[PDB]
Design a protein around this ligand. Sequence first.
Ligand SMILES: O=C1Nc2ccc(F)cc2S(=O)(=O)N1
Ligand SMILES: [Zn+2]
Length: 257
Amino acid sequence: HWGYGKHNGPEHWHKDFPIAKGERQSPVDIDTHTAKYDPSLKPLSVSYDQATSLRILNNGHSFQVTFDDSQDKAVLKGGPLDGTYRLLQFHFHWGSLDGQGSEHTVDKKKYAAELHLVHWNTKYGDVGKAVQQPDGLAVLGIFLKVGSAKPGLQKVVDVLDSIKTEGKSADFTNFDPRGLLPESLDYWTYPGSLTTPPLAECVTWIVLKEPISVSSEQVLKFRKLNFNGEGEPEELMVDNWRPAQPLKNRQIKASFK
Ligand SMILES: O=C1Nc2ccc(F)cc2S(=O)(=O)N1
Ligand SMILES: [Zn+2]
């Protein structure tokens, strides 16, 4: 029922999901002058060499690439995190125009898109249990700006025409998510939530400072996807981002000076 339209979009979500007005909702604006360097933070450990991708699919809100998380194969550790978080899936949020599309903002600047690499805390055994815990998930967020092409994204872009409509999926094995990362792992971190229903307050957010560049042709392909299912009226999948939410009693910490 929920979506991104005028009658079912983010301003309506609180009716079915009252946590939408909660104390640790995401995304947020990152005020770079107020975020404080925290020397007690550790370097991120992004260990994706053994990642096993499985499928790519259009879920009617985004497209996602899924991974085998039945073993410690692609894991996120370190930084603000305690323990080991397994990569489950990645997906994107993007705009109808290059000046909007990201969920997090940086000094109110919106990027053209935002990549979320979603990981869950193995101490909770499965992702369904993890989402019920304040430290159950860690999402690595990466901004996209439009400029040069990202070679590691092209294999994704080239298969999108096969998952145009909600409910479509395809095999997507042997994809290396390391090709989506920027050079630097400098980051901001804060406690937050899922950015779609159920908006559960279970996420340690880790937002990289360095955006990746993608080409206009790459992002244009995102914008040709459909929110609707096959044989329904075409509504382009664009502007599938939640706007920044109140920071409330939270501090955003920087890993870098
Ligand atoms: O739109 C989003 N929906 C999600 C849904 C489930 C998650 F586990 C993580 C996210 S997310 O907060 O990374 N982004
Ligand atoms: Zn997301």
